[PDB]
Ligand binder design. Structure first.
Ligand SMILES: CC(=O)N[C@H]1[C@@H](OP(=O)(O)OP(=O)(O)OC[C@H]2O[C@@H](n3ccc(=O)[nH]c3=O)[C@H](O)[C@@H]2O)O[C@H](CO)[C@H](O)[C@@H]1O
Ligand SMILES: CC(=O)N[C@H]1[C@@H](OP(=O)(O)OP(=O)(O)OC[C@H]2O[C@@H](n3ccc(=O)[nH]c3=O)[C@H](O)[C@@H]2O)O[C@H](CO)[C@H](O)[C@@H]1O
Ligand SMILES: O=C[C@H](O)[C@@H](O)[C@H](O)[C@H](O)COP(=O)(O)O
Ligand SMILES: O=C[C@H](O)[C@@H](O)[C@H](O)[C@H](O)COP(=O)(O)O
Ligand SMILES: N[C@@H](CCC(=O)O)C(=O)O
Ligand SMILES: [Mg+2]
Ligand SMILES: [Mg+2]
Lengths: 655, 660
């Protein structure tokens, strides 16, 4: 779910310029939740914008943001020509994990049939049931089934029982959050406080952007406790704020945000931002990083840009002249990491596959036990963790709920915690003792592509550090590093087969299932490949450990069942050939992903995807890219959108 | 694939009785699958059995043992009434690997057109190419495309080039195995050694049963290297020996067996059994607690159905003598001399393949809880590929119903080389994994004759839980938890009967999925293994694409498969993950999914809001996995029966037949 609001203080904007800014802001956040959307602005059609702040209008509709963008326009009541010198508008896109994605369950929620208080919420209230019964007894009627409505009906209860006639909007919100349990990122708007916005958070992101041609009064807003305190233009009033749950919706307008913190109750009053209970900083992000460029989809871009993101992951960290690896984020801890006795990799989904993909080389080069855990199961079992465990947390977004709770679980037990993240300032990167930012750039597509290969590369670089003092492993280190030097170009070679992959997708788009088989370094490849095909093509694809065929799953193979096998020139080659012979003996007709030089396999197999050879512990990067491409093409053939798969969105930050 | 030889020494038997005993032996080995069978015996119709010892007759045929039995009695020139005071008959069921199924490629393989030597073989001779080239150059013509025939021709080569006229049958076979490469179990017979048998093995099971109304000379056969030294009846000669590759072919005659080991050469000479070796070590004569009834279908139409519905009994047999509900104590006799060391180790590693691996996943959480040690569960094939680090203070468990799975066995030797304490959780006495582990527990579920693991899974489950209960029997703070679990085991057999009484409800579900091509089985926590195991059963038995999905992973991708057309089975039990399982259910339903829910009888909320629910009784949280997987065992069974499949037919065949 995404949050976005636009507050133009003494910056005249027509009602069309404001609505096109709220929609354009949700488009930047649509990848976090596209089951429904809504906006909240001021109604009425009075030339004097002052006589319109008392009327709130809510336009909410089911579907992606494009369904709402059309619902806003072509209306017979809203005149899109009114000039507003001061106006506040809030928007929201929702990931409806429960119930129906109806307009009533979408945000903003309202407190009454006259819209005196409207709020947009990201997160969950763990006690909204108790709050709902208390509010129903005092005379408040509920309409929606969401936990967000208990926040709108409650901020009005704190307003109907205030002590003074002019209690600040902050005091009302402060009394609400004290009754709310769980996490939340709220943005309020009320007719009683025209133009005044309030943004409080607790375990959920929420920043405030600012733009103004004038000089700002400070760059370090001092947090307060219940002229030289608020952020505002000095001489004039022309200022534009941008509340948002992510920086992508604000970079297009400005690169000056104020990241809030837990329980920081920000408030814009008279166009002055003040925090209650900061640092006005610049964003290290360019707009081109969140643009599709000349690609028809973000996922396609992010796949074909893996030659570059692999390079950025190694930038300033790998020196091929002298074969040295330095991860700055682990300089002050690499010594203590080496005195520990076990590695534990904890993550969900594709990030968990990255740990599977690198488990073997980590075991080889560190010689420590390595355990790879799915976060949700790690928590269910109350896995034993000890003071001399080193726990890695792989999370592209750095906000995954299960991975984050696993982190706090391990910290409570004294383990050294290491983060492998792609989002600076995220919960997981902050709360870990150390870590590495994989520096892959923003990932917009729901299905992770470059985050997997960048996590892969990052864990390999770590392994290379852990053994840089072993004489016996010096050559092995050079071998791997020479592989990394050649990886970007070998990735380009794999991408050049895009057309050949597309041809093969036309021979499979109609099937209902596909088994992907591999072992060793390519177990993770067949798990991740199966996950991608599931996620965006909706075919029933399943990864099967090749060595496990003889123990049951081989019974499913016949001349009709599609099969993809991965056979690379590493130490499991012969065992992979036996698995291939078993599939053939069952009349299977598999597609084999093999090395170009593997002439024996290429002759005896009709359909082969010939990838270039690399180091065994890097080949997994080259063998998974074809399956990223296959899933992409299969989705296009089946008429699906690769960037917006059904039933979910990107980053699981709630239950 | 199956070996059986019957040696009656001074126990008069007619030719009919001998042949019926060979046929009956192969009938006990058919469940292992085969494409042909054959028998070898003494031909000739001379009323004196002593003159018929130089005429070996072979009857081999492609097809089932039934057809062989018909071919046996369909012999016009054979007199079935001759009485033999001493005789050796050998029999074999073949799973063709080298050479296509045929009479010529069936066993026994002969050494020449006069059948001077014959041999039956389980396995593959890797270097059979070089061996065939050599013997051909020395002037030995082959007639079959089997690797086995090289064994028969080679033993005659050693005989043809013996130094003295009285070199022992053992010596010849010793010189043969020293030239063979690969895996083999063998039984030899020859006109030049009438009444004698030689059996040897390398990488393939071979055992010897013995029966005699007289006192036997010893229960521990010493090894002889290249009276008091061998096994024999004392006061009289009468004795019967049974060579076999599986105890199922011996248990009806005797329960006293000797388990041969790699490169042992066992020989019966003048009715006395000795075990020679080229390398006081000996081989024990032990008593098997196996009964013929345990390998018969009885009133059940299939072994799968029997082994599912008898799980109330097998669970009881797994616990017998090991749990004391009178004072809440657990005693696994097999761990008495090692439990102290195990408690001083620092990590548990469970290593297994397939369903046996699922048993580790199903008991990982309770092992962690009750031992407080790290518990790592590893698929044997991947454990080996990665060269997993193993240390001297690791306790490595090896779960295996058969005790012969190659990868699990190689993982066992991997861990022994690194000094780890090794523990077996097995269901086959005398199997490789039982012998080679430092210690272990025989789960005592009875032989598993069905193709798919049913009672073995639940008995492995119970056995690992019992081990967890031993590991914490000294912790005051855990006494209550141990009592709760042991009262759950006390009630488990009756709870299983309750679940089995819902068979009708499971059939209804089978017809609903009759036409379906896929089904997602979703669960978490204690029931992650239930999903994986249920998905493997339905794949193996029903041949539809069933897949287990960890419920907590739905929102990370796999949930995209849910729509109004995808069948789904969800497991929601009354444990600590109940709320998270409800969340997963709301996620599915929100996307038009209409799942079938396996839940507790008294979960009224889910029963009303879900159309079809399989309602199992509630047990301890760490035991519910046994009750929640049984409806999936039955589901797989009924779907296959509906689709015309033979649940007792393997199908899963290895690589094709090398024709050469
Ligand atoms: C964010 C930042 O200023 N990065 C700078 C840092 O990159 P580096 O490559 O040296 O470090 P990094 O970006 O990987 O990590 C930055 C800091 O965050 C910590 N960390 C990182 C990831 C995680 O999940 N958890 C965690 O605690 C890490 O321990 C370090 O203290 O130095 C570079 C020059 O060499 C550049 O100046 C980079 O801009
Ligand atoms: C096989 C056998 O005759 N067991 C007898 C033994 O059972 P316990 O129930 O006393 O033995 P159970 O078969 O576990 O173990 C028998 C022996 O085999 C060993 N073992 C077992 C399984 C494995 O995978 N690895 C391994 O090393 C185990 O350490 C022990 O030395 O005593 C009983 C009486 O109390 C009965 O007389 C049982 O028949
Ligand atoms: O293609 C699938 C998605 O990428 C998904 O599986 C993702 O990997 C997880 O939701 C974990 O997300 P993070 O890596 O951001 O924590
Ligand atoms: O139904 C499943 C099968 O039984 C199969 O998966 C079996 O579990 C493995 O082949 C391991 O066999 P063992 O338990 O004999 O090692
Ligand atoms: N390799 C031998 C024996 C195989 C077996 O039945 O185990 C053959 O194919 O004849
Ligand atoms: Mg940090
Ligand atoms: Mg043993």
């Amino acid at each position: 779910c995404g949050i976005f609001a636009y507050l133009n203080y003494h910056v005249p904007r027509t009602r069309r310029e404001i609505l096109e800014t709220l929609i354009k802001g949700l488009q930047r956040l649509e990848y976090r939740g596209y089951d429904s959307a809504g906006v909240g602005f001021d109604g009425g059609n009075d030339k004097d914008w002052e006589a319109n702040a008392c009327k709130i209008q809510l336009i909410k509709k089911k579907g992606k943001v494009k369904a709402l963008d059309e619902e806003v326009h072509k209306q017979q009541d809203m005149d899109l020509d009114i000039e507003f010198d001061v106006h506040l508008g809030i928007a929201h896109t929702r990931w409806a994990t429960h119930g129906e994605p109806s307009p009533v369950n979408s945000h903003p929620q309202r407190s009454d049939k006259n819209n005196e208080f409207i709020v947009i919420h990201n997160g969950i209230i763990t006690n909204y049931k108790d709050l709902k019964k208390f509010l129903e007894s005092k005379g408040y009627d509920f309409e929606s089934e969401t936990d967000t409505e208990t926040i709108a009906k409650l901020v009005k209860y704190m307003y109907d029982n205030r002590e003074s006639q002019d209690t600040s909007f902050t005091t009302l919100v402060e009394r609400v959050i004290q009754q709310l349990e769980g996490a939340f990122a709220l943005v309020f708007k009320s007719v009683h406080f025209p133009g005044q916005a309030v943004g409080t958070r607790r375990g959920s992101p929420l920043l405030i952007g600012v733009r103004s041609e004038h000089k700002l009064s400070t760059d370090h807003i001092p947090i307060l406790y219940r002229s030289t305190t608020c952020l505002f233009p000095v001489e004039e009033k022309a200022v534009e704020y941008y509340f948002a749950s992510d920086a992508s919706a604000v970079i297009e307008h400005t690169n000056r945000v104020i990241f809030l913190e837990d329980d920081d109750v920000a408030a814009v009053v008279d166009g002055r931002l003040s925090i209650h209970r900061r640092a006005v900083q610049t964003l290290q992000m360019e707009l081109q990083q969140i643009m599709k460029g000349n690609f028809s989809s973000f996922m396609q871009k992010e796949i074909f840009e893996q030659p570059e993101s692999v390079v950025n992951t190694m930038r300033g960290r790998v020196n091929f002249d002298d074969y040295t690896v330095n991860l700055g984020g682990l300089k002050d801890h690499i010594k203590e990491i080496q005195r520990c006795r076990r590695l534990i990799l904890i993550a969900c989904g594709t990030s968990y596959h990255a740990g599977v993909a690198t488990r073997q080389v980590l075991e080889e080069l560190t010689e420590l036990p390595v355990m790879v855990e799915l976060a949700s199961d790690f928590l269910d079992r109350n896995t034993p963790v000890f003071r001399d465990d080193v726990c890695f947390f792989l999370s592209q977004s750095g906000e995954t709920a299960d991975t984050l709770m696993g982190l706090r679980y391990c910290k409570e037990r004294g383990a050294l915690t290491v983060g492998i993240t792609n989002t600076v300032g995220s919960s997981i990167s902050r709360e870990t003792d150390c870590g590495v930012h994989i520096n892959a750039g923003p990932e917009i597509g729901v299905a992770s592509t470059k985050a997997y290969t960048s996590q892969f590369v990052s864990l390999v670089m770590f392994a290379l550090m852990m053994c840089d003092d072993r004489i016996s492993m010096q050559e092995r280190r050079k071998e791997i590093m020479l592989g990394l030097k050649r990886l970007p170009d070998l990735i380009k070679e794999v991408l050049s087969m895009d057309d050949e992959i597309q041809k093969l997708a036309t021979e499979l788009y109609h099937q209902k299932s596909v088994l992907i088989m591999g072992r060793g370094y390519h177990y993770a490849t067949c798990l991740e490949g199966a996950l991608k095909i599931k996620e965006i093509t909706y075919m029933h694809s399943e990864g099967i450990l090749a060595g496990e065929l003889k123990h049951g799953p081989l019974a499913l193979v016949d001349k009709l069942m599609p099969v993809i096998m991965i056979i690379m020139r590493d130490h499991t080659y012969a065992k992979c050939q036996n698995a291939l012979q078993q599939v053939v003996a069952r009349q299977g007709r598999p597609v084999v992903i093999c090395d170009k030089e593997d002439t024996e396999t290429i002759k005896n197999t009709k359909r082969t995807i010939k990838v270039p050879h690399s180091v065994d512990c890097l080949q997994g990067i080259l063998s998974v890219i074809p399956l990223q491409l296959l899933a992409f093409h299969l989705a296009v053939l089946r008429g699906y959108d690769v960037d917006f798969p059904r039933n979910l969105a990107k980053s699981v930050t709630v239950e």
